[PDB]
């Protein structure tokens, strides 16, 4: 038996600590996608989210991050040696806190993800939902103040540390 994992990000704003966000990962329904995000959060394969930034923050919509390989939001990689398939579309973008995969079309999952700050139903069936904020939604809300209509951020929002809890 295994309970759904819990991971955390410690968020910083221009290097200054902001707070902790934790996530439940729905390994019970999307095990491969949950496992990718979990391992990238611990860094246990030698690469992952620590030190990366949220390169798009769109108030009222989502915060996107996870590119730890390129400078322009085109990078990142999964733990599977290649971009991986959309595992399933069981779960929907139902409201604030939903954690879902960014992609460049069908079956192109890498490491980039987004945290919804509202219901984003138009993304259902194209982005794999795999988790949800557990604690620290107020920190995600604080992050939104640094975004803009087109996602450009006015301060550098980073994952100063990340890992697994419990």
């Amino acid at each position: 038996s295994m309970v759904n994992p819990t991971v955390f990000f410690d968020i910083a704003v221009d290097g200054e600590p902001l707070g902790r966000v934790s996530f439940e990962l729905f390994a019970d329904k999307v095990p491969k996608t949950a496992e990718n995000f979990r391992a990238l959060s611990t860094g246990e394969k030698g690469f992952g989210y620590k030190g990366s930034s949220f390169h798009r923050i769109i108030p009222g919509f989502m915060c996107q991050g996870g590119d730890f390989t390129r400078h322009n939001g085109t990078g990142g990689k999964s733990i599977y040696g290649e971009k991986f398939e959309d595992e399933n579309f069981i779960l929907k973008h139902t409201g604030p806190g939903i954690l879902s995969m960014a992609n460049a079309g069908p079956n192109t999952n890498g490491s980039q993800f987004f945290i919804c700050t509202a219901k984003t139903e138009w993304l259902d069936g194209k982005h794999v939902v795999f988790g949800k904020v557990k604690e620290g939604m107020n920190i995600v809300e604080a992050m939104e103040r640094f975004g803009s209509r087109n996602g450009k951020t006015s301060k550098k929002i980073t994952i100063a540390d990340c890992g697994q809890l419990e």
Binding site: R56, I58, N72, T74, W122, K126, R149, N150
Partner: protein
Amino acid sequence: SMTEYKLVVVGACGVGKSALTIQLIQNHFVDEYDPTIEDSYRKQVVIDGETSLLDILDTAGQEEYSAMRDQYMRTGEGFLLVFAINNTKSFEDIHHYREQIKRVKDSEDVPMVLVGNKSDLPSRTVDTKQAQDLARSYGIPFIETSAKTRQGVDDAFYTLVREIRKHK
């Protein structure tokens, strides 16, 4: 007084919408690809001896984000419909952007220019004749451009301004 023209650049991913806009605004070209959500620019130009203010809305999103792009397109007075000569999908997509313009502007007669970009490339998948025939079927100009060499860049934007002036 100085008249302002609201120009909107649309088309499929990677065709060169931003590179064309940056050539107009900043007079350079880079190979780096920085994907757009939306970016707005302003620049004063002289067209046919008249100083004019251009507002350029550089768009993105293809079909998945088309409903959001409607809101930027609704601002526009004229449109560049951009495809790349080595990208068949981008040419097949032009119809979608044309229909989106007609819907959001609620008009069958909207100032537009068809732009065939990447004309510097040594290979192509879309015939120039296809683009000429498409533009003729829409009753709009067709301009061959390269953001890399600057071929046709001023002509595309200035022609669009003249199309707006003929519509009024």
